[PDB]
Each structure stands twice: as structure tokens, then as C-alpha cells.
Design a protein around this ligand. Structure first.
Ligand SMILES: COC(=O)CNc1ccc(OC(F)F)c(Cl)c1
Lengths: 300, 237
């Protein structure tokens, strides 16, 4: 069980760790988060009490280094850093742990939610979507735009999701215009899966990461990417049986976790109605359709 | 964006553009079968592709064989229309290719956009105008070449005849849409008006009769009366 120690909490802030969150008061003696499950990526995220503008946070994997959080009064945010001195890090954390100044990652033993939301998410792939190679962790916030959004303006601060565009030469084979537009299987299976992602795990990992950025930061381009990757599968007539079954599980846990009050902004009525009721895969997402109908029947 | 009453003069500026109407691409007669079920029989159709500035009409005849063994023909018809318009554009020299294509029905937007991906600089636009181009098959010479076709064929016409020698494009389009609106509202009356005086004929190389300027004013007045009448006969006013 790993630990992300905190130098201090100089400003009042709501701190998130994965799907959990807690309020820290200005100058409260808070010194970090312990008992973080090894084996998963994680996200530690922030919303200042005085400016609920800019949710922001850091994707990390404790297997890749020792990370700590310290507030920067110049840039005005909680920053993640890597401490290379492993002895300095054990000493800082043991001191903090002995004085019980850390919150414990509050995982219920029965509860597979985080695993289920991050099953295919890999740190190495996050670091290719979020480019900042000198760090092992990845910063994301509410305002960062995607490469695709930029085409339609600072490239260093962009989310390099895989561009999906249903009315593009990449998606449409010359001579198969109607076929490829109405049945996107060649775009899904040859262009994206075989060509770009290489396998369905990487595709699902980017899908899951886009959802999590949409949910935790309200990042609009991430929500667009999540919906596009759903729609490309549902709009394909020929999808491996194992991908459909896995997609149903993936979406079920995403819909289950979504705050009830954010459905209005984070769920695209057109895509969901198309995917559940009109698409080729309208009958292949039983778990997702059941939770959607019982939780958000208005959207439908 | 969409074409409407506000940007109407844009049709007659010097940027090449084409209207595309797909109404008459997929045409059927509905009939009873011996078992007393209903069935359709396709008849020849046509794409109505028109330069509103010059009058040049690219009438692509859609022969019934194109539907043989196909499913969901009304959907296919939009994609076939888009395939043929894209083929037409590619067939034209660069300096004749349109800068905009305006579709008369919004269901043509995605089919045409997808077929024209190779031409990102050609704008595909809808329109809020309710244009009467469905009535093209009420023009006898257009109907005749469509019905007589035994294979796919493209036929070229000027739908303004020689009117541009005497009137502007704006006025020529206004006359065309008035004639077509009349033909659509009451075809029989409309055609009676156009031919009632047998001394006025249709030249072999023309579609409409050879009216003088004064005779066109009388004709156009008779078409308006017809349209208003029918509007009354319809709603009772
Ligand atoms: C730049 O001067 C430094 O001392 C950086 N080293 C440092 C500071 C604080 C740490 O824990 C903090 F979380 F409580 C750690 Cl683990 C390392």
C-alpha cells in the first residue's frame, strides 16, 4: 500500500482521490493519503474553495516513483513532484504516518468500482495522451482542449486523444461511401483497432480515460471523445463478441458512478438513444441499457 | 449556412453553384398483387442539378435497373444521387466546378458531404426555400427523355431557353420557379395556360414556348392567379 505525502495545505480545497473526496480547511494539518492500492492508476484532484473554476489533478501510478504534493504560492496550485531520494521519502511518510496526519484511501473490500473504471487504463498510454515527458505523472484540468478541438491553441497543453471523425477520408473508403458511413466496421476494426490502437484493450483504455477526465474535471473534449468511441462501436455491424460484452460492463460502471446531478451535461442524448435503441448493437448492451433506463429515463 | 430569403441574390453572383434536387430520383407506381397485397414498380427517375445563374441543367437519368436487387431504396436513392453529383463534379474542368452545392432536401446533406470529401473547399448547403423542382417532370421534354431511357444517361439542357438574352438571371429564376410552382399546384391548368394559343410554339431546341415579353407578362399573371385560386380552392377563402 503506497502513500502520496503532502508538505501542507495552505489553502482551503476539496481533494479527490479516485472516486473519493474530502474537504481540507485552510492551513489544516493535512499531510497526505495513505493505503493507496497498488496495481491501478490513480488520480488525485483538486477544487479550490475560493475558485471552483479549474478542477485539476494528476494521474499517477505509485509503482513508477515516489510522488508528493506541495502547494506553489506563485502558480497558485497544488503540484505533484517526484522525490528521487527514497530514504528521504520513507522518512517523510513514516513521520506523517506516526502522527496520524494522513487520510486513508477508503476502499471497501467488496468494492471493485475503481478496478472496473480503470481496467484497461495504463500509465504509459496516459503519458502519450498527456505529453510532458520529464514527469512520470500527468496533469489534466477542466480547460485543456483536445487535438481535435484545436483543429476546428497551445499544443503543449493538449489532450492528444485519437482523432475520430465519421465524415473524414480516414473513416470512408473511396467507393464504399454509403456502406462505410452506415456501417462503421471497417473504420473500427481495420483503421482503429488493427491500425492505430493495435488491440481492443488500448481502445478501451483511452475510452475509460476520456470518461474519467470528463467526470472528474468536467473536461468537455474528453466527454466528446468518450461518446465518439462508444458511437463508433455501436455504429459497427461487425464487432467481436468479447468487445461487446466488455463494452457493456465498462459502460455499466461508468453510468453507475456518474453523479446523478451531472447527467444533464455529461451525457449526450443523441448518442445514447442511438446506441441503445437504433444502432446495430441496440440489443448487445443489456446491463448498460438496464441501468440507463432505471437511472436516467428522462434522457431517453 | 442555409440559403433563404435573406441571402437570395447570392444565387446570381459569379461564384459557380448548383442546386441538387433528388425528389424524382426514386419513383414508383403502387399497385395490388394477384393475392391482393400491395407492391411497387419502379419507373425511371432523374437527378435535377441546376446552375441558377446560367440555366444549365444536368439531368442525370436514373434507370430502373440501378434499383435491381437493392434494399431500402429510398435511402439508397440519396446516396446514388450523391454518387452521381460527385461524379459530375469530377467530370468538370476545375474552373467549372461549383464552389457551393445547395441541396433542396436536408436528407441529402450527409450523403453528399461524404461523397465530396475529396472536395473540402466545395460548401454543401441546405436551403429554407421551398423550391418547386419536383415539378420538373411536368416539363414535357424532360419527362419524355426520362421515360424513354433504356440505360443510365446524362442529358444537358438550358432550363431558361434564351431568356437570358433579354432578362437577368434573377428574373429568369423567378419565372422558372413561378412556372414550376404552378405546374405543381395544378398541372392541368398550368399546361393549358402555356399552350392555349397554338400560334406560340416551343422551338425544337427549347423547353418552353416562344413568348414575347408582353406575352410572358400575361402568362405570368395567369400563373399567379392559378396559384392563388388553388390556394383558395384548397383552404376555401
Ligand atoms: C525542494 O525541497 C524539498 O525538500 C523537496 N523534497 C520533499 C518535500 C516534501 C516531501 O513531502 C511532502 F510531501 F511532505 C517530500 Cl516526500 C520530498
Amino acid at each position: 500500500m503506497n502513500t502520496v505525502p503532502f508538505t501542507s495545505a495552505p489553502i482551503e480545497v476539496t481533494i479527490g482521490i479516485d472516486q473519493y473526496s474530502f474537504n481540507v480547511k485552510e492551513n489544516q494539518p493535512f499531510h497526505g493519503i495513505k493505503d493507496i492500492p497498488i496495481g491501478h492508476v490513480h488520480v488525485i484532484h483538486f477544487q479550490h474553495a475560493d475558485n471552483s473554476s479549474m478542477r485539476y489533478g494528476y494521474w499517477f501510478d505509485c509503482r513508477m516513483g515516489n510522488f508528493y504534493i506541495q502547494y506553489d504560492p506563485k502558480d497558485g496550485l497544488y503540484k505533484m513532484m517526484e522525490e528521487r531520494d527514497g530514504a528521504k521519502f520513507e522518512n517523510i511518510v513514516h513521520n506523517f504516518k506516526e502522527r496520524q496526519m494522513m487520510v486513508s484511501y477508503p476502499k471497501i473490500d467488496e468494492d471493485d468500482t475503481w478496478y472496473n473504471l480503470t481496467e484497461f487504463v495504463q500509465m504509459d498510454k496516459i503519458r502519450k495522451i498527456v505529453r510532458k515527458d520529464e514527469n512520470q505523472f500527468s496533469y489534466v484540468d477542466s480547460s485543456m482542449t483536445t487535438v481535435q478541438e484545436n483543429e476546428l491553441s497551445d499544443p503543449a497543453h493538449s489532450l492528444n486523444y485519437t482523432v475520430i471523425n465519421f465524415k473524414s477520408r480516414e473513416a470512408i473508403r473511396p467507393g464504399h461511401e454509403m456502406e462505410d458511413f452506415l456501417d462503421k466496421s471497417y473504420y473500427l476494426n481495420t483503421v482503429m483497432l488493427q491500425g492505430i490502437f493495435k488491440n481492443s484493450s488500448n481502445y478501451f483504455g483511452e475510452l475509460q480515460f476520456a470518461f474519467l477526465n470528463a467526470m472528474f474535471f468536467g473536461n468537455y473534449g474528453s466527454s466528446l471523445q468518450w461518446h465518439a468511441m462508444i458511437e463508433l462501436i455501436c455504429s459497427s455491424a461487425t464487432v467481436p463478441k468479447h468487445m461487446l460484452d466488455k463494452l457493456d460492463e465498462i459502460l455499466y460502471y461508468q453510468i453507475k458512478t456518474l453523479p446523478e446531478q451531472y447527467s444533464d451535461i455529461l451525457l449526450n442524448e443523441r448518442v445514447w438513444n442511438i446506441c441503445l435503441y437504433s444502432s446495430f448493437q441496440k440489443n448487445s448492451l443489456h446491463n448498460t441499457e438496464k441501468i440507463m433506463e432505471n437511472k436516467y429515463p428522462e434522457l431517453l | 449556412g442555409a440559403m433563404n430569403s435573406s441571402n437570395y441574390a447570392e444565387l446570381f453572383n459569379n461564384d459557380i453553384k448548383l442546386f441538387v434536387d433528388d425528389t424524382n430520383v426514386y419513383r414508383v407506381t403502387v399497385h395490388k398483387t394477384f393475392e391482393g397485397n400491395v407492391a411497387t414498380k419502379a419507373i425511371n427517375g432523374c437527378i435535377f442539378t441546376l446552375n441558377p445563374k446560367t440555366g444549365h441543367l444536368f439531368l442525370k437519368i436514373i434507370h430502373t435497373s440501378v434499383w435491381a436487387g437493392q434494399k431500402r431504396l429510398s435511402q439508397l436513392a440519396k446516396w446514388k444521387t450523391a454518387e452521381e453529383v460527385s461524379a459530375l463534379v469530377r467530370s468538370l474542368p476545375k474552373e467549372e466546378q461549383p464552389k457551393q452545392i445547395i441541396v433542396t432536401r436536408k436528407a441529402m446533406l450527409d450523403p453528399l458531404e461524404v461523397h465530396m470529401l475529396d472536395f473540402p473547399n466545395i460548401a454543401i448547403r441546405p436551403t429554407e426555400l421551398r423550391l418547386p423542382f419536383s415539378a420538373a417532370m411536368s416539363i414535357d421534354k424532360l419527362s419524355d427523355v426520362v421515360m424513354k431511357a433504356t440505360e443510365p444517361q446524362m442529358v444537358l439542357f438550358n432550363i431558361y431557353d434564351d431568356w437570358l438574352d433579354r432578362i437577368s438571371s434573377y428574373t429568369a429564376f423567378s419565372r422558372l420557379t413561378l412556372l414550376l410552382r404552378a405546374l405543381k399546384t395544378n398541372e392541368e391548368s398550368a399546361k393549358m395556360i402555356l399552350l392555349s394559343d397554338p400560334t406560340i410554339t416551343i422551338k425544337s431546341y427549347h423547353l418552353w414556348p416562344s413568348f414575347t415579353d408582353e406575352q410572358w407578362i400575361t402568362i405570368e399573371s395567369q400563373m399567379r392567379d392559378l396559384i392563388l385560386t388553388e390556394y383558395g380552392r384548397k383552404y376555401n377563402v
